[PDB]
């Protein structure tokens, strides 16, 4: 995020960070249940990857983070790697998360819902704060 | 480095797909929703995370960070996967596994 603000720790509890095997952060994700995460199809997630829930500071010397194994990756078959259209993947947790003051799921909209142009939304992540 | 250790959040307005087309023309397809161009931008590393809006006192997933400005320009709108467009696929998947 460029020009964001620091978040209150644990206030965006479905927020997850995916780490590859070498160990660190390559993408964000959102917990929609205790067993499933949604993220982008462009992230190229594979079962070697791990989902980290409960994180605030990727520096945290140690926290009550939960690292989850990914049982199966579900990549939308319509994903266009040239256009980047249908950018989504579903990740089915080998082991379910344990919901708590800090980890919990976001809600899903219905295909018919209307978020009007001008609506105030919020985006979060650990991406670059400056180019 | 420019990578934060603590989680960032930024509030931003959603855009109409035809205002967005202004900026990106033809690269904006069916399943894409734009937001920003208003002093914030998602940036490398933000990919796959959420774009959420409050509905009925609750946060809902409207976007998935997908691509944007080649420089993270805070004046160009980011492009998110539109959930709306993809949630039937998600629900069927969930219903089925």
């Amino acid at each position: 995020i460029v020009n964001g603000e620091e978040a209150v720790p644990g206030s965006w509890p479905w927020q997850v960070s995916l780490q590859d095997k070498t160990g660190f952060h390559f993408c964000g994700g959102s917990l929609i249940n205790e067993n499933w995460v949604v993220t982008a199809a462009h992230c190229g997630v594979t079962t070697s990857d791990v989902v980290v829930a409960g994180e605030f500071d990727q520096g945290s010397s140690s926290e009550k983070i939960q690292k989850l194994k990914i049982a199966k990756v579900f990549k939308n078959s319509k994903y266009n790697s040239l256009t980047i259209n249908n950018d989504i993947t579903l990740l089915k947790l080998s082991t379910a998360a344990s919901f708590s003051q800090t980890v919990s799921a976001v809600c899903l909209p219905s295909a018919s819902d209307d978020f009007a142009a001008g609506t105030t939304c919020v985006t979060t992540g650990w991406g670059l704060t400056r180019y | 480095a420019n990578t934060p250790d603590r989680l960032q959040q930024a509030s931003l307005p959603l855009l109409s797909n035809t205002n967005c087309k202004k900026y990106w023309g033809t690269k904006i397809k069916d399943a894409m929703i734009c937001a920003g161009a208003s002093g914030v931008s998602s940036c490398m590393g933000d990919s796959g995370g959420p774009l959420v809006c409050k509905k009925n006192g609750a946060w809902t997933l409207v976007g998935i960070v997908s691509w944007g400005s080649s420089t993270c320009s805070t004046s160009t709108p980011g492009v998110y996967a539109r959930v709306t467009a993809l949630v039937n696929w998600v629900q069927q998947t969930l219903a089925a596994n």
């Binding site: 978040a7 644990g10 206030s11 965006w12 509890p13 929609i32 976001v106 | 959420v52 609750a58 946060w59």
Partner: peptide, 8 residues
Amino acid sequence: CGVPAIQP
């Protein structure tokens, strides 16, 4: 879903 224990 969607209501954190900790308020943004």
